[PDB]
Amino acid sequence: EQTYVISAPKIFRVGASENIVIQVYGYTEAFDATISIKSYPDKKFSYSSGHVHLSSENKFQNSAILTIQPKQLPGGQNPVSYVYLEVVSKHFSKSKRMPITYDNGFLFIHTDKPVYTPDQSVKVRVYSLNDDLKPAKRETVLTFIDPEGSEVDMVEEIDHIGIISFPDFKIPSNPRYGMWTIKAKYKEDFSTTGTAYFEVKEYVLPHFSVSIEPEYNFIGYKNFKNFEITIKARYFYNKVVTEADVYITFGIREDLKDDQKEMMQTAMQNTMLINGIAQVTFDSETAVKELSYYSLEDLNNKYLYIAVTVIESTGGFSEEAEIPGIKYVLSPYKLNLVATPLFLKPGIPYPIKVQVKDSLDQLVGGVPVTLNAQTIDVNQETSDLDPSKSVTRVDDGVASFVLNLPSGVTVLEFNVKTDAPDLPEENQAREGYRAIAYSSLSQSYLYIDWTDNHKALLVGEHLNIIVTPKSPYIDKITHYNYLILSKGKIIHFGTREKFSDASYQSINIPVTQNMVPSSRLLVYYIVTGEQTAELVSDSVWLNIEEKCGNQLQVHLSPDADAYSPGQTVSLNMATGMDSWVALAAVDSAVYGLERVFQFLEKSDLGCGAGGGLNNANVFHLAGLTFLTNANADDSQENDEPCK
């Protein structure tokens, strides 16, 4: 049998270099194939095409960097939402209806301060990066949207280096208070958008400063009955207020997004402020007895909106201060899964690596974890496995499990629960799940996993991934494969020969710079035989330490725990290569906060940490399409590939 596999990102990106891969098997003679993107549905216009040469020296694999030019598309009423990826050769020819999206690139608006007062200038700059994460150099448009929703500005500034500094925005002297909105956007042919927010609040000179400092930021199992609040009030930086009357109002809250609040007129207690510090205790249980909430089991994920009004005695002044919310936490721990595909390979040890987190999202250790397992076979004869106990290693927060299953298993309904030394049964954290089996028309499966879990693979190292097949016909598997996605681009490919004397094989993968900070590694082979060949694929997710190509580093010279006003100080910037550097220096008081890598990851079209229902689904989850004379299914349903 002679097989061929084409792998292209699931979504072709207008204006991006959509790398396509072609891997053919069985053919021994050198030959040429021209991968081509063609219009829809008549294939009349060739948006682009590429030439590959497939030889024994080339291992019969090659990549053709295609590119849909932005101007080559119609406009107005009907710009194409579908293109035909098409391959030609003297042997085969295949085509598949592929989607295209214009959302290419990223725009990060960066306003210096997040809160402005009337008549301050809004310093706004925009970074423009294309899908390759390189300076875009395209003409951008801002649009300051007032709190009511009407555009009050629009200003275009051409890019030259990727950092597009804009003319400052002057907040009027009588502005419209609320949460304004900036909307950077590309001017031509790209649907890329960027958004930032900044509040415009009127400055009100305060009689004095009232500061609230709660005991903890969360109300767990213990402090649900008593909650010490430290309410300090002071004049202008070290003039202690003498005596004041402190009125406190407490109310339960739903969500920090909408400012709805429900008051509790049963505990609007007030006290006497004495010499600058007055501390009260809030009994959450008896206070919430309005509607009574019937337990600590309720009120979970809710906030305790604290309102404090300090009215001092001497001058008759009044001042108010609040805490926006104190989240109720039902359990001092949170569980989640790491490096576990929610898809089962019948006949393979299913490793479950649960990870325990505090309410601060910090990896706690030494927490015993118990895990039960309810299974559903093909005969629906549900079988229950014994509870296993694993305790979290303090090095990474991962408490490893290995849950072997019989061959006939399809749906494993396993449930992890914390078993803390000091917590009652109710106050423990529990998480259920549901692992489905790899659906294969044959009895062929694949399972791959790399060296260890407690290091978070670092760039520059080498990856020793251990690919283990499990199937009949195992002694006819000739070639493996591996495709290493990143940001939606197929940045690698190859083939490793299988040693027909060994069951598994250690694939050696060189970690490069393109793979930062998250990449997927798809691996598969070809089970062949009677009237059909079969792809059998299993993917993983490689989380790499967030490192730059150009690591930036700023120092202040001289360095000390304190400087003096007007002092002349030097800023020392050192990079890896020739690189522009934007700068900013804001008062640290506005922050009581720029996170790009979370916004810069919306380009990874994948979902989950690997695995899949069937073969085609292991691809469609990793963000690849595929053309193959073997099994091909699982059409787009482009809306919501995975969340």
Partner: protein, 82 residues
């Protein structure tokens, strides 16, 4: 430790029991590799008593190594703890 699971309507031929392409005699408890179990069959009612490797719960200072080479119990996930 290792739980058990019993299948029904197993292919029994010539008094021998072949299951998942593993031929096992009637009164023979043979260690297998694919899958990795310790199995025994009965052609009288066409059922197979089979036990798995015990599920591993990893405590402090331990880790799991598993290679599919060899038959039970060497094909089992071993609770390797230095």
């Amino acid at each position: 430790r290792g739980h058990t699971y019993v299948t029904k309507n197993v292919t029994v031929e010539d008094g021998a029991c072949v299951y998942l392409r593993n031929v096992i005699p009637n009164g023979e408890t043979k260690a297998l590799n694919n899958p990795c179990v310790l199995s025994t069959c009965y052609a009288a009612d066409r059922k197979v008593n089979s036990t798995l490797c015990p599920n591993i719960g990893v405590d402090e200072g331990c880790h799991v190594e598993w290679t599919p080479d060899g038959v039970y119990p060497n094909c089992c996930p071993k609770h390797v703890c230095p």
